[model samples]
Target chain A: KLLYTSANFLGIPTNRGQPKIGTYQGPELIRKSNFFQLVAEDGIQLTDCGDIIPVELNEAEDPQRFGMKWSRSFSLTTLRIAERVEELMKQSNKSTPLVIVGGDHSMATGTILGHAEAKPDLCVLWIDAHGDINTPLNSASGNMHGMPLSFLVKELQDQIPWLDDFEGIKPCLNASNIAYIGLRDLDAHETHDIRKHGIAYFTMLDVDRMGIEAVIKEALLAVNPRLEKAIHLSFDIDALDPLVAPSTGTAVPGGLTLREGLRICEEVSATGKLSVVELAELNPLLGSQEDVLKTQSSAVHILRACLGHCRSGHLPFKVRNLTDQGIMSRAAHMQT
Target chain B: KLLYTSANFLGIPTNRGQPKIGTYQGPELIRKSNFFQLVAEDGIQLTDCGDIIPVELNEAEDPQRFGMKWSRSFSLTTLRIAERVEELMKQSNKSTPLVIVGGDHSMATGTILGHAEAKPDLCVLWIDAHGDINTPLNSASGNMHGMPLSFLVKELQDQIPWLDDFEGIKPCLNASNIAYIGLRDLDAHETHDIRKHGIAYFTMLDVDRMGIEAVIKEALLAVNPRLEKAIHLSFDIDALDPLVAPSTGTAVPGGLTLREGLRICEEVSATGKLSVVELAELNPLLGSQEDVLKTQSSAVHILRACLGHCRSGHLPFKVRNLTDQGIMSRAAHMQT
Candidate 1:
């Protein structure tokens, strides 16, 4: 069984100073892209937990917190997400996966802490273009989305203050237990943190040099070598090249290709130890109508691939080696 | 010196019936995307050979030939291409590489054949979504672009009739000396031929199963194990996912990513024996203006990668490990 939920709450307090409104609609937008078919078609029983409504934050004290803007919103909203994710992790095991669609990457703070409550040994595969590990002191834009991991990594407990005082939400992920992939854009301080903590991070350059397969293999080996640890794949749509996922808020160029992105998800599914998959920052408001359609469809495809939609054919819904010639044999005649 | 040329001749004879005129302008369109900068920026001595003018044929008796359309045009046009490529190969060795921008994949028949004339031990990495291996008899559309290898594979000499009997022209590539990558769409006949000959072919399904890095390694090993032979990277833009290179003549979805495509080129360049790289079937007239721009920019990038434009950094134009943290260090600060 799978648990599906969405965070319709934007960490950005006001949509006035910045018009980041459409992101709250990411879950519904993705659902329109045949989300039901993806879950149902695979026979993975999906329970829709609906959307996580935003907390009525005290906007008066939000600016008073450490340079991290909207600290109260980030704290309360993510606490709800964390509790939900924790519940999902407690109920679901290896065979069952829970997907949390988000408004911003900051939701990973909730998702990660919630999972760690029940499954502490889980290694997080942070598939994103940015590190999302910046501490409040060094974060440039004061966007909590960049500091989700800062609130989650055990080593950063001393550095993250505002996010620190949250009760029942201790930083659960170790710097070593996290692997960053598809990262092309990172804050300089994020880079400094990774080096200081000896984190298992694969920048786009490593991806270019080592190939995504090798990079993935090494990342998985470094973080969860024994394959015994429960895995959490936290995906940001910006992990994909802007051309493919253009509707995202912080679009990055020269990120993972669509195939590479899907491959990462497919490989994680193959591990069979997947516990939770969190998709964040798929803002349907950023680009053109066609761009939004493309981004949402691609996002749906990523979810399907993560949930075991094998490219080389699956079992029942798929013909098991139908023609004696193997998986690619039929591909030729089917299209051109 | 790098010998650069363009085949402006469309393999499709009359633009009236097909309206494939945009393809004939592929070379000119690509040049507009800073082609000179890519070559000269690398300090690779450049020699411009101008465009390969279309061969004027006797259109009167064209329909009288074997069912293959534009046989005479295909014959003469590819013959001219073959001559030019052969000359480039004979003059250029490994360091002195050559690039031939193409009108259609059919020109590869000339490029490969001519390449083999000078460097007989050359291995061809036929990177495309389609096999382009159909014999004229089995070809559905009779478009010569899909049948380039038909005229070049040593084993298919008997099956290909209409393409035979050209003076000084011969099938110079052994089926074993060729490896197909990024093949998602292959004809039944192509599949049949591959199995019968035990040709090395990695389809998109295979790409999914085995990462592109492993696929490229095995392909190179299969075709040129000793690594002594020259490498010819025959890249069909269609090999890339239609989302990335949408302006191609024949587009197939679920193809290689832009990264994978560039990686293919980068790996081939790393071989130190890349003799002639052939780019085929980039139709500038296919999509909307923005789509065309995206496709052309992507095409230019592919060409640059093929010509030793390193993602990690090149030599003269590249900083030697600019930062202590290695290639990706500068990436983070430069963007965001």
Candidate 2:
């Protein structure tokens, strides 16, 4: 159980050299695992999967091609690793809860793929600030970090594959099997894709105008009737507004307010079927010291919530199901 | 009395030969005399204050021959116009609320000058996203609109003596006499200046950390005691989080959320010291239809709050204000 998944250390296009400080791999893989070691030891099930080297970028495969596409490699290769994780889960008997720590969002391709491969009939609840629907051909930044959904939904089957062969997987999911909550920033292409694909996307604007309760309830209902039976949750720390979590490499200004973010976590916990949870993109280089610390706290808080931590009150670590009356009686509150 | 102001076009330094839309002179002048006309219709004691001509690019004393500094011409001219408005206000006889419509925030140089000139013993309240303290010499964009406060407070000699000295009114306000609310973005230099000078600022983080009521109350105490009379409020609509008012050209997102923005307005109105009010920078040109309407609504909403029209539970017209009365209200509740 002392395994660490620091796979995000691989960056998109794998910028040359070993991972730099702010590079997704360095902080995500090494630093995140370090955090897991300290905290996971205390009443938490910890698993360090280690880094999954992409076959193409593997130093063993072609030492000459190592570190050439850190960003692309880190982002693109996660799909394969995700499948590997699923294979492992299928073999194991421990059914507590699968929490995958990640470095980049692209890892979700494999993360969700692996989970879907395991369950075959699970729903995905993507709580993020962006749609993450870019394909290599259409991505503006050419960073695969924001383009994983296209791969999972069979829309980009020609772009990326989940496993070595395409025999058993039906692209993992369809439009109806997934729902995105807390979407805020979007380019024309992304908005069109979400609309065109008929993906159930509850934008930040919708949350603000429609209220968090209404949006979350609608999302839970639309994705699947059995809220707690077979659901996978993926959270990107960037989903929190920059003011709340500014350390992420790609910080978009308007996003889920802190309270809104907490509410999503609280709602996800209520469902109980949450099989997998992954937190991604916590680069420490972009913001001030204050920003980095805040980012760390936001990520940890959400993870705690996922473990039935905010079972009753919205406060982090208040898992009522674990004990009867040991936590803060009130709901989770904002820092202010 | 009744007054109106709108930011229908962006007041930005045009690229190459793009014709600048809507001069500060036309609108400020219309608002100035228009207020007097309303007072006249009511048969109230009032005096007319003429408008000041903003120095258009071609109108600069010798733009073609002298190779004028683009930044200095428009903003300096705006400062001159503010000085003129101050003169006009002093020359008048009535005690009607002075409503200064916005052009670009640079025109605030005039609003401040006019207020300081008319009543040297008044506090100035700034509501917006930026600190607006980048003096001409240090500004990166060279946009005069971005450097107004820096220029106005450099002399720190309270009351430019010629706050209406369209010719040369050195400094119109001091650091202590000013208080900024709803601030979200601050550049390095601006932060340094704000810190070095001990200027009173309430950043969005601060507002988020400390509820709007507390921040505004603190703001009222900070500036209200300094001035013996009511305060002069100069609001650059862009200070509002762009999500709330998306039409401004210089919108640095992550600003005061809608409720926070309105709360600040309500708090200020509650103080009953709102003297000269200027709602500047609505910039419709750089936005989409949705952005335009959102910004327009934000401006109008704040205006109503300023006039004691929107803050009160009852307004003669249809407006939205959520007090203890109910949980939520929608568009269907447009009017009485």
By TM-score, how accurate is candidate 2? 0.50
Clashing pairs in 1: none
Cα error of candidate 2 at position A309, Å? 1.5
Every model's TM-score: 0.58, 0.50
Model 2 lDDT per residue over B242-270, tens place: 76676666677777776566666656655
Best by TM-score: 1
Error of 1 at A210 (Å): 4.9
lDDT of 1: 0.73
Residues A151-228, candidate 1, lDDT per residue (tens digit)? 778898888775354765677888899998998888888888899999999989999998888988998999989789
lDDT of 2 at B71: 46
Q: Which one wins on DockQ? A: 1
Model 1 CA lDDT for position B37:
70
